[PDB]
Symmetry: D2
Subunit: 338 residues, 4 copies
């Protein structure tokens, strides 16, 4: 008996995880938000999958779904997951990402499955914020830098408390940034690949970004959902960092993406006046707008996943250069039909 309940199923990770579990024969249930428009685009092709309307801010609907499903595994991937947006939607972010994790854990307990279900919490490298060690590992002290990070830090600890207080098998996946052709358009990587594709297809000339110098450890979401499953197959509930260990800047993501389009970006200027120009035509394709900057930036992330490699036999499979090429090519094809 393998029955998974995935909150956040319509999102990037939930769509890949649903495919991964379905491939292993699981009965997969997802919680979907009511929307005035179609919002199951990433999982429509899958429709052993059953969807249920619900919301992490509504405790009763969570108890009803859990009681009906009686899941053996629960992956809480549901979240307002964008950092910039969390600065103006701070309360909504706390209620969903923080208190919502509590509501889900308490629904499991109310449903009497405290000793039967395994629970995965979608923790994040954003918890390290202004990093206290480089690279960051499980024992590196957290230092959140946004309402999103603080809300996720509450969720990380309430999951630890349910594990310690009630013996729930619950684990925190401390995942560093992971992208894919399904990444939300609002994250920097997908914003770049979509924009570069458009410029290639002549649908766009230039686009603006915020902080070009931010440095990230970027992996492919498909590889990372496999780590979530591996953490719930472990004999004991443990928390793990999952990451690539390699760092690149936003500037580098931009340069490599344009290379796939046949253009070489040359940078000129500083700060909000810096621009990215085609080395040949001299045409400006990238500009900077402070409106995209964060009040308290997270300047650098680099994860050390030695524990996961040794205990779960997990490892990144897709590297940075291949990730970038895949996203640009996927968006060129997508935009082609536009």
């Amino acid at each position: 008996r393998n029955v998974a309940l995935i909150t956040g199923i319509t999102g990037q990770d939930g769509s890949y995880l649903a495919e991964f579990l379905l491939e292993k024969g699981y009965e997969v249930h997802g919680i979907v938000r009511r929307s005035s428009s179609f919002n199951t685009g990433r999982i429509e092709h899958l429709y052993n999958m059953k969807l249920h309307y619900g919301d992490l801010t509504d405790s009763t609907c969570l108890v009803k779904i859990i009681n009906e499903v009686k899941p053996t595994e629960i992956y809480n991937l549901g979240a307002q997951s964008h950092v910039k947006i969390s600065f103006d939607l701070a309360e909504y972010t706390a209620d969903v990402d923080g208190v919502g994790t509590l509501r889900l854990l308490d629904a499991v307990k109310t449903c009497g499955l405290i000793n039967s279900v395994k629970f995965y919490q979608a923790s994040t490298s954003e918890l390290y914020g202004k990093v206290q060690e480089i690279p960051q590992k499980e024992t590196t002290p957290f230092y959140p830098r946004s309402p999103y990070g603080a809300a996720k830090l509450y969720a990380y600890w309430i999951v630890v408390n349910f594990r310690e207080a009630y013996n729930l098998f619950a684990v925190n996946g401390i995942l560093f940034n992971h992208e894919s052709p399904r990444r939300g358009a609002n994250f920097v990587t997908r914003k770049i690949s979509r924009s570069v594709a458009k410029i290639y297809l002549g649908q766009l000339e230039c686009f603006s970004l915020g902080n070009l110098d931010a440095k990230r450890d970027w992996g492919h979401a498909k590889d990372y959902v496999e780590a979530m499953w591996l953490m719930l197959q472990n004999d004991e509930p443990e928390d793990f960092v999952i990451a690539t260990g390699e760092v690149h800047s936003v500037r580098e993501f931009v340069e490599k993406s344009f290379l796939h389009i046949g253009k070489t970006i040359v940078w000129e200027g500083k700060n909000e006046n810096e621009v990215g120009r085609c080395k040949e035509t001299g045409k400006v394709h990238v500009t900077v707008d402070l409106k995209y900057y964060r009040p308290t930036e997270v300047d650098f992330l680099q994860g050390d996943c030695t524990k996961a490699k040794q205990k779960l036999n997990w490892k990144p499979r897709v590297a940075f250069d291949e990730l970038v090429r895949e996203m640009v090519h996927a968006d060129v094809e997508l935009m082609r039909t536009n």
Copy 2:
């Protein structure tokens, strides 16, 4: 200076109202929910229009948006608007549709606009529920029949209270059911037009409905948004019913719809056993499934818009027959493209 702020701008009505106001030279602002997927499909062609991330359950976010926008007219169309879904998402529905209306009124008062802004609240014929008079007018006593109805009733009265307590120009548009080619696919009219369109195209053979006997007063959303604006142009803030005054059953909507694709439906059986088959080929095209029924149904609605005619000089332009035709043709063209 005409600056409108529309909550629920990505929904059916918000998309038509944005068009209507843009056409009048308004500066239009909309509050959009953060989503992991693209969710501005109904208004993307409008890109005079400014969108702001927000949520009716986050008070500060509404204050920030209203201070930045400084609107002269606010239309609160945002809501979890589906009745059936409200039974399992009762709390979220009360928080968004009921308390959210107060959050928006309180943001207005906090932003110092109580004496300058005009506020439109999206009330609804669902307030009459188990109807206390036929037809229903502004003075017919309410009798909600779902968590949605109850939440909208709290919103109706908190709006009346800000009007009476603080002289805010605030009104309740008590609109009866209105549809269009942009209607959510989950509502009965669009579920029928889309399903009939697929059958015609050979992309579907049969679909199931819930209660065939329910009767509704159905108008076209494009006509009704005009009445919203007119209420905000009236000299005094008053509440108004907006409706066609004509009633049809779900069964008749089904019949007229198949008629537009050259099929005549004949019914057999009763209750959940009843079926709809092509009178010419005898093929079953419509079945019933209890899962679509509601615990406490709203059997009948017929609205009386005499007051709106007298003070607004308003009257519906599209009638029932034209509405069904338009939706079925629209969906045949949409399904044909994919």
Copy 3:
């Protein structure tokens, strides 16, 4: 098996209801809010009674409590119950009085007791607000006049909806104003009795009120909680107005309270400048301050409780004059200490 769960057990009504049910041999459980200070003053003498920490804004705590208690009767009396206060705490009032009622109903359902518990909702005459008929009865249309009234109106209908959708035995008691020596200090009657008692004791010289001309139908809370239990004893779940049918103004409550400490108030002036002065001593003891007015007043309330008299055989025992005397005498004794 008689097990009652009372939300709002520390408040006026909850305290009288808990006593009434304990006298009938019920096992009584109440939900109490965590407080930094002692807050069980009204029910300490009762401590058959068990208390549980909880809050109507925390869903899980309500499920936990109900699951443990398995009550046969639930009385939802918990609420931010003050009208003036609701204008400045309109959202908290909505969340506790409106959504909190839904939270308790869903907890019942979640716990599998939808068919085994009888539920009483503390509805109110404030629902009639700007009254649409006089007197007001079960069928008089509602017209709320404050964030409190709107929130209680939502509660009223969500209770009807659980009754209609799921066959829960749930009832709305539409109670008109009821007071007692246990009434909160900031309601008008207790404000007047405590202030009049302090004046008699030489602890105060004068106090200010708001709208002296408001009219109310005032009963005694001890009489009204009996009606709540009667509603749950009824064969079918029905809604009932509970009231005295007699009206008095705030001004009359003031006059009668002063007569009980040996003073005759004589009014002079108008509106915010009106004052009540002692006939014998010539001292001003009552003034008016607009800060006590409500933006949208409820001018008049008079309940018709024919239905309850007929079906429940309920009748109020304490009349207005006796309520005033009891409140003033009790506060004179209370303030002496």
Copy 4:
């Protein structure tokens, strides 16, 4: 000139802090919760103090109060502060202690006072939970052990975020346990001093406790509120541990309290069967009940306040022995009356 706004003014710390600030000539404002009973007992003798009704879960009321008061200093002491209660009131504790801190910070920002107010957050040694270093200091990593600790940890970091993101002068006082004759009756120290006083007076014979072996750093609340004010007088906003650095067990607090009433307690038995019996009379005066234990105990706390001592010139004045004597003596006088 000097205007303080204190949330949690009716509690133990708020009552002492109000007195400390009134002595310095401050105009002191407090936020008090609406209650069906008198709830201002600790501050009624103060009657330059003004009270405002409000709740940390209602943002509109906080904006209204901060606008009216325009404080130069805000002390956020308001909280559901009991650890045991937080296990069954986890969501309410999160909404008040965690999110409520965000609401108060956002209200300061909405009110335009981000650059003029100084903000003190009531952080706590419970943040160290399962302690990662002994003694604990500012740089010791947090490890919360209850819904109260997780909620306070969200609050600690959202305060840090407003300081860094918006230059708010905001500080976290990481205070270790502090008690007084005004401590809440449900906390262990006051439970013991009240019970022992009743025993001395003949009003009680025995009482039950939970975990006798817990160890704590106990100081006197009057000394500690002085530190809160000192942190807001510092030139730069910094976080500080405030504590005595001396540690005792619950068992020693029981033993010393009984000594003040002329009794020597002798322990017998183990775990939930352990009892404390009078050496002279052999009467049992203390028993153990597992219902007072916590699922995840905080076994030991010892604070290192070296930073505060050096930068603020603060030092604890009341030592443990005197704290116990004062509390038992005050409770004997209190109970003598009734």
